[PDB]
Amino acid sequence: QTPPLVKKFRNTTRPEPQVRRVFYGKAEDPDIASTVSHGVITTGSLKAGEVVNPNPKTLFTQRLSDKKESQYASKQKAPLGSSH
Amino acid sequence: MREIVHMQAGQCGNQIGAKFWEVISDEHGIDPTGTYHGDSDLQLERINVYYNEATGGKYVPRAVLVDLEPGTMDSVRSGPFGQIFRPDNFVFGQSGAGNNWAKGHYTEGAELVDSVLDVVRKEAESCDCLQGFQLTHSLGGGTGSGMGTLLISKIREEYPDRIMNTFSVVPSPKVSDTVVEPYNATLSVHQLVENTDETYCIDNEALYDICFRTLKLTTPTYGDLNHLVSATMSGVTTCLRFPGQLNADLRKLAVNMVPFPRLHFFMPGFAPLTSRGSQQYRALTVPELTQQMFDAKNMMAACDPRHGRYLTVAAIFRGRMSMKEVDEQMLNVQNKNSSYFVEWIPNNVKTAVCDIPPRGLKMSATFIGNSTAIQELFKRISEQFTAMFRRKAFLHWYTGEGMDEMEFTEAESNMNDLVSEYQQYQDATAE
Amino acid sequence: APPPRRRSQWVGEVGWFIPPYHDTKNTLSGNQIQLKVFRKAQEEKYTHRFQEPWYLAPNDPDYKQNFPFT
Amino acid sequence: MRECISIHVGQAGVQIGNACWELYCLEHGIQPDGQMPSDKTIGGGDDSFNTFFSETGAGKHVPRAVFVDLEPTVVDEVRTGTYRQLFHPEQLITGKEDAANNYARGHYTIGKEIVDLVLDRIRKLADQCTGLQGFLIFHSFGGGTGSGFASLLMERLSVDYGKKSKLEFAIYPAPQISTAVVEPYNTILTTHTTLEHSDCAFMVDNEAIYDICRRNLDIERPTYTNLNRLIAQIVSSITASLRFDGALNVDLTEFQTNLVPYPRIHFPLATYAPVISAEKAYHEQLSVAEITNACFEPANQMVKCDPRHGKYMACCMLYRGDVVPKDVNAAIATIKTKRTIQFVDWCPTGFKVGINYQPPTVVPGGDLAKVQRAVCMLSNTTAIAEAWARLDHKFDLMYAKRAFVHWYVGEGMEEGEFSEAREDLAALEKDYEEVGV
Amino acid sequence: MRECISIHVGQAGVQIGNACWELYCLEHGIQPDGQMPSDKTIGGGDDSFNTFFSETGAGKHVPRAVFVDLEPTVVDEVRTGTYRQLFHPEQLITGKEDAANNYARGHYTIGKEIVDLVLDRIRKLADQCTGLQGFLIFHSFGGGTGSGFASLLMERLSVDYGKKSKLEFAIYPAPQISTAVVEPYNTILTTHTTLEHSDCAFMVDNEAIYDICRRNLDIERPTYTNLNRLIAQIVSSITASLRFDGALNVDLTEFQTNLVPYPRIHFPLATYAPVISAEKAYHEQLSVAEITNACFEPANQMVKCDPRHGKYMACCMLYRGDVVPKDVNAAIATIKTKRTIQFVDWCPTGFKVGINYQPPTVVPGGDLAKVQRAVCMLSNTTAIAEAWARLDHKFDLMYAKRAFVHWYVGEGMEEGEFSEAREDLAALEKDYEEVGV
Amino acid sequence: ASSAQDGRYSFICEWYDPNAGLTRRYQFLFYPKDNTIEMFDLKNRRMFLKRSACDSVHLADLYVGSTVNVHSRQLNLVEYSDDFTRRALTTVKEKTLGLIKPDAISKFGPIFDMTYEAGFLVTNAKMTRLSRNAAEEFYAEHVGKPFYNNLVSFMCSGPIIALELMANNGIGEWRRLLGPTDSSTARSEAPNSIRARFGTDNTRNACHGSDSVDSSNRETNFFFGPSARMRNTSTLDNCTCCIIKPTAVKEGKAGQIMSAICNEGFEVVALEMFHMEKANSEEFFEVYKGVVAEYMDMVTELTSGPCYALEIRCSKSDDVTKAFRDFVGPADPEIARQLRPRTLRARFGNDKVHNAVHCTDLPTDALLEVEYFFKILS
Amino acid sequence: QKTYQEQLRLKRMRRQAEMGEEEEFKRQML
Amino acid sequence: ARQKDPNTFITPSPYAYSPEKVHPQGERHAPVH
Ligand SMILES: Nc1nc2c(ncn2[C@@H]2O[C@H](COP(=O)(O)OP(=O)(O)OP(=O)(O)O)[C@@H](O)[C@H]2O)c(=O)[nH]1
Ligand SMILES: Nc1nc2c(ncn2[C@@H]2O[C@H](COP(=O)(O)OP(=O)(O)OP(=O)(O)O)[C@@H](O)[C@H]2O)c(=O)[nH]1
Ligand SMILES: Nc1nc2c(ncn2[C@@H]2O[C@H](COP(=O)(O)OP(=O)(O)O)[C@@H](O)[C@H]2O)c(=O)[nH]1
Ligand SMILES: [Mg+2]
Ligand SMILES: [Mg+2]
């Protein structure tokens, strides 16, 4: 039987028939290696169910938004069904 | 990973290779039984560069032992680290060359070269990268010279794209050693010219000198010399092994040290060779490490670098070090000893640094020198060769084994043509 | 006799004292840029790579290029 | 979105990247494991890190760079040291055989094996990319992988990616100190390819960084770590306007259209100020006049050639931190009234300035100090011609009798490309002379 | 209602079957003994499992599978394995001898002595079926049972039943890797009979799944388990729209009316994305554009054919998981505007897109990571003709020497059948080449 | 991503058809981790609701015997299927009985506020007197020492408010929030309890608790059981009817409404929480019937669970109906928030359908409506 | 001023770390 | 007027450019014999 200290270096040169070849360095490092997802996970994306047709806004929230959108120029000299 | 194989031929080559294997094994943390008892991970990050993978916790070194006498094999098995080698690559004859180049090349050459190449193929096709071949043979011997040169030729014929460093142990210029020593030296340097992508020639007499004048330890014998050569080889091949800020392998050294193809004869050296009584008294740093490795007293080749010019010089360092100090000292040696450097190559030094020093030392360095002064060794070899050749002494043996004076004079002709080629690139001007 | 270490386990380093040190004052400010709405728009515009329903005019010469068969 | 993809090729480039990504992680508050702390987080819509990092699924900010080396040594050091869980496991691309200081070996041989895989990874990183601003390519001219394989990457990025600006930070060889021996051959062979395929080639001299470190930072024994840290600080000061908002924002195309006059003079000079340590910084005022005089002081450029023997063409002053354009333009006026900084006669105004509010960051235990203001000098002088002439001298002296040519010929290079590259750089020198006069 | 009988014939078919019914049971939440646990309480109107699992009165769900093989070891391994109490024991038809990789053993001998029993078994399943939309025939073109008895079964189901769809999943030999030596003979002999009695033939190749799981899953030694797991994932992604509901969905008539222009071009390539591991998926975004571009890689096709040598006729784009049709349309638009994605001229629009919300499930102790998104690519291309060219070259090379012909001519089959099959597949190749213009 | 094998919370819901006359039964699956509700139909096996995604349904409610408004259908969760849910929801979920003492009758508003802040969901609540026959629930605490006599004196002296609580980890969480059995120990170690901030020394505490299991059963059967006649403390007289709406009760603002009413003058004489039926709510709202277009919305909102009913009297006479109408003034919360902001339905109101408090409009109908709740239905 | 004092304290802590490593290597040599 | 939006970038095209033909990262070299 090969002693482990020399088997360390024999695995790089002439290992067993199966089993992935290892280097004489990088051994006795914590072989996390596998059990890892191993890849990038897409990008993101926010879906087009709430960017082209967003959540509906309440009457109070839109009235506050219209309050803020008032005292402009274009929205104040020309409302929909009235005058200035 | 750039794997090299090891070749060790002859008794001296086998002993030097075994010492090299053990001095890289104890810095790799390997017991003689093969079980890794080291504590750091750096010494087995790249351990397959020299050791074949095996079952269990055992690493089996990749070397081939070539000899013609079983006594050397029995001695190296009974010695240290003899059981880490498998008995399959232990090839040996039953007759013995007896320091005979022709007998080791033809009579028992091709009978053993087939088995050696069978083991070499079995190792090399099992290898995946196969950087290079590292031969530690000896010039002047039996199986070391002739069989090793035949191995070099066969390996070049088989794989003509691979780097080989062979070490070509040069005997003592003085004394006598072998009666057929100039014959074997010429017959070996003939093939050292031929394929031999890099040769790191070591001299035994200069090894005695560096052991007696720098390291002391009373008598030199051979173990300290073998340890010196082994440390030099380890410092050479450290970059394929242990990492560093700036690495340089066999191919990088061959590119950065061999200008023209027949300029592959190197003069090595090792630093720091402090004594046991001066280790605690020496302040080992980059400046006097550079001075020690560039000192002429500490060249393990018998040729003195002061009478020649360095073409290229490799400096392979090991330890806690700063590259500014490295290249600053490698420029300072140029600017000081600019006389002993060719002016047609700026930056005649290739640097390399490892940051793992050998155990017990803060710092070490390996000198490699492609000097033009190495041509004096081949000139002396040619002089002794023609002195023993003009009377045809000890040549009937080689003609009986199967060689001829035409091959003798061809080896002499291309060897002294190489000497004149060193002379021409030593005395060549810039403009 | 401790062995020689790596490059990382040195003082004077590439990766020492990186977990316990965190630059608090320098980069907890608004000096660092955000991905706000009009950079998010540019980063989300990347989802229209050559799928836009803009077709070339029949009063333009380059019309039989997009209508070869008729 | 202003993403700035990076390729670090060669041992030198890998070490630059090893310093750079540490600095970027500290600048953007990224832990070495890859995640970002929640108490650090100033909101989930932060966007500074998107230039250099990408967040995959769970705050895992992986860096947008490719590490390249034919020998595995430095990339294995990266894989075993600290920043091991940060990088993608496949992005750290390596071979086995090295080029070993050989342009032909890096270009016509084994370098042509992994080029398809490495720029397939570049292509997949650019597929992940959406707002690609440019290619930050870090290499060295020393040789081998950073010399030939980098040139191959330039060629294929050029005719695959269109305009697509390619800023090339390169470790240029020093005049006297050097490491390789065939380094002049590799530099000469690499310039001939990078000339027609680069857009801003920032040369960095190792000896210049060395003496800057030992006289300004007072580091007696500096090294490659400090070298790459300083280069990382400069490249962060360059591409900080893309990551943070500024009073005057400069991008990688405004920088180019205000820097390069003609489409062959695209070899600027980078310079940082201050490069002073903490002890010297605490005792000095460091106003905008001092940080401009430090940039224009001629022992501070990052290639060993003084600008006094040359004429300035363009200066892309990138101010960083708490600076005001009023001190900036007063300093620009006093630089203009200084006679020794001779501007060229066909360029009346030659100062493109970009102010960024974000103050520079420091590594935990380096040598630069946490200063409230800094500035990146970006010269377009003619003084680089001296460096080109020095490399021509070295290349011709080693090419006089065909030294180190058999290696390239055996690897596959013909004998003519040395002469073609020499003629090309001689033509570049003639262009510099005729535009300087 | 929209039910599917799966007939697994041959050893490869049986192994794909017992590696696929595991995935089906895990997807539908069925533990291996047969009952859905659902914490012992939940069921009723969830009719998602009717496409594969017939309902008994005891709450036990029996799969609609016919596991048939002549040589009784693999089916006996199924009977003695962990999926023992799942399958109906009479639905586990075994012969007594082996076909031994022979088309004659199966078309003119012992398979003919069991084909009547297998037709009676399929008839007794179809009697319980109440509007069966199509058969799924899992087999290999290797030889013996998977070509022989399988072709005979297809002829008998063409004589009986009638207009109902008869989709097959065919394991094809590799260009280089060959387990047997009579694979070209068996492929040419089975193509002549599956050309006219089929309507869709999904194309996979063992060497191509080898390369895919060798690079991406980085398993150096791929056994057959993960191969059949990947094929199971493909069939799961195909039938996901017949089972679990979602967005725009594509079923057995949709991806035949939108993929088969002429009643001979019905050989689609099925590739899967992302074939990835846990560690590689951790440092990766895995977006829709990336997973769509991964299917158009040359190194993701599950048959070893070069897609450059041929146009695309039609493409079925089967997405699973957290995927958006806007991102799908963006990916399709990028693929269409990339020019060298070469579509044939008689096809302005060539993308049939199906989208399902179910992410893939990973088997315990498996090798794929649980990725949110997945893509099944069903491509009709001219590029499949090179595999037929390679098999014609192999068949001609073996038939020139009259090698391995004595078995076939001695065991009932006539000599001229080889020439008739060769000229039939040559006519098919000529049809593909003349329609690809 | 969404799968077919996620976590699932299965229930059986019964909706009474406005037509026909039989209550149809549906299977109601609640997938968490995406909050998606799906609905099967037992008998006439068909498809009723897909995955989708609904707001109303919230994991927090569930609680068998409850009403969920899914696509304007008043489903009643009648019983638990799914043993998975039986181990995920029923486990350690007990019912107690909180008995408010006569000295704690003055602070029953804040007491109810803290019970709702804890999460003790109520099932019944009634204000009675217990007569001299309160000893039948004190047979357990008998003979031993004269605290039995003190207890039967303290029960017969002053009114009593009986509660039937229910929460996870019941009978122990209620005693934890009550603290110990003495006010000295309460303000010694747990100075945030009902017995700590309200009450005095022993046998004159602020509540009773429910002892343990099957003593809770004995108390609940003694007080709110089908065989228990207890009689509320109604006295008619000059009074006004206050109806805390089930939307407010589900959101948990019922105790806040009670505390605000008790703080801004007034007094509560009779408290009783009902579970109104469709025809009973129609007969309560017949005075509106055809004067407001939102009468059907008011009826279907009143038939949505708990129906806290209060008899409000005032020490200062004036007109009790007019004073209570001024305090619980303008019906639309937008009206009450923009104008007279310190009023009920403005502190606690969402829209005009969910007023969260109901008050008697005509001054001659308050006595009729008080008679309808406290003298007809109880 | 506080930023510069904190930076100086960090430099002092780093220099203490190098003193620690050099005395450790000196004890290693001895 | 409905206008054409500016082009983002054409980022090569993974069909004609072919990686293929490469030994996968770090699995020896399958020794031939
Ligand atoms: N600034 C800086 N330069 C470096 C560093 N490391 C190496 N260099 C430069 O690199 C050169 C050495 O050649 P390299 O660039 O390393 O060669 P290579 O890119 O590895 O390619 P091969 O030679 O085939 O291995 C030297 O001359 C250095 O200038 C570093 O850390 N910082
Ligand atoms: N994908 C896949 N292919 C398989 C598997 N098992 C066998 N094969 C293929 O099948 C070929 C061998 O022929 P078989 O399919 O076993 O022949 P058979 O249909 O069982 O008929 P006999 O040879 O008589 O047993 C091989 O070349 C494989 O490519 C498997 O488990 N998965
Ligand atoms: N360095 C060293 N050199 C040696 C040693 N043994 C022998 N030699 C050298 O080798 C030479 C003899 O070679 P030899 O061994 O006979 O070669 P062989 O016959 O092939 O085994 C002598 O000149 C010695 O200098 C040793 O242990 N160390
Ligand atoms: Mg290198
Ligand atoms: Mg079989």
From TrEMBL, chain B:
SUPFAM superfamilies: Tubulin C-terminal domain-like, Tubulin nucleotide-binding domain-like. One of its GO terms (molecular function) is GTPase activity. It holds the Pfam family Tubulin. InterPro entries: Beta-tubulin_BS, Beta_tubulin, Tub_FtsZ_C, Tubulin, Tubulin/FtsZ-like_C, Tubulin/FtsZ_2-layer-sand-dom, Tubulin/FtsZ_GTPase_sf, Tubulin_C. Keywords: Cytoplasm, Cytoskeleton, GTP-binding, Magnesium, Metal-binding, Microtubule, Nucleotide-binding. Tubulin is the major constituent of microtubules, a cylinder consisting of laterally associated linear protofilaments composed of alpha- and beta-tubulin heterodimers. Microtubules grow by the addition of GTP-tubulin dimers to the microtubule end, where a stabilizing cap forms. Below the cap, tubulin dimers are in GDP-bound state, owing to GTPase activity of alpha-tubulin. It is found in: Cytoplasm, Cytoskeleton. Residues 47-244 form the Tubulin/FtsZ GTPase domain. Its cofactor is Mg(2+). Dimer of alpha and beta chains. A typical microtubule is a hollow water-filled tube with an outer diameter of 25 nm and an inner diameter of 15 nM. Alpha-beta heterodimers associate head-to-tail to form protofilaments running lengthwise along the microtubule wall with the beta-tubulin subunit facing the microtubule plus end conferring a structural polarity. Microtubules usually have 13 protofilaments but different protofilament numbers can be found in some organisms and specialized cells. The keyword Metal-binding applies. This is Tubulin beta chain.
TrEMBL record, chain F:
ATP binds at residues 101, 147, 175, 181, 195, 205. The keyword Transferase applies. SUPFAM superfamilies: Nucleoside diphosphate kinase, NDK (SSF54919). It is found in: Cytoplasm, Cytoskeleton, Cilium axoneme. It catalyses: a 2'-deoxyribonucleoside 5'-diphosphate + ATP = a 2'-deoxyribonucleoside 5'-triphosphate + ADP. GO terms for cellular component: axonemal microtubule; centrosome. InterPro entries: DM10_dom, DM10_NDK7, NDK-like_dom, NDK-like_dom_sf, NDPK7, NDPk7A, NDPk7B, Nucleoside_diP_kinase. It comes from the Eukaryota. It is an enzyme of class 2 (transferase). GO terms for biological process: CTP biosynthetic process; GTP biosynthetic process; UTP biosynthetic process. Its EC number is 2.7.4.6. The active site is at residues 208, 358. Residues 5-93 form the DM10 domain. It holds the Pfam family NDK. PROSITE patterns: DM10, NDPK, NDPK_LIKE. GO terms for molecular function: ATP binding; hydrolase activity; nucleoside diphosphate kinase activity. Keywords: ATP-binding, Cell projection, Cytoplasm, Cytoskeleton, Hydrolase, Kinase, Nucleotide-binding, Transferase. Belongs to the NDK family. This is Nucleoside diphosphate kinase. It comes from Strongylocentrotus purpuratus (Purple sea urchin). The lineage of its organism: Eukaryota, Metazoa, Echinodermata, Eleutherozoa, Echinozoa.
UniProtKB/TrEMBL annotation, chain G:
Signal peptide: none annotated. It comes from the Eukaryota. It is found in: Cytoplasm, Cytoskeleton, Flagellum axoneme; Nucleus. Belongs to the MNS1 family. Microtubule inner protein (MIP) part of the dynein-decorated doublet microtubules (DMTs) in cilia axoneme, which is required for motile cilia beating. May play a role in the control of meiotic division and germ cell differentiation through regulation of pairing and recombination during meiosis. Required for sperm flagella assembly. May play a role in the assembly and function of the outer dynein arm-docking complex (ODA-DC). ODA-DC mediates outer dynein arms (ODA) binding onto the axonemal doublet microtubules. This is Meiosis-specific nuclear structural protein 1. It comes from Strongylocentrotus purpuratus. The chain holds residues 351 to 380 of 499 of the full protein.
TrEMBL record, chain H:
It comes from the Eukaryota. Residues 20-30 have a biased composition (Basic and acidic residues). This is Outer dense fiber protein 3.
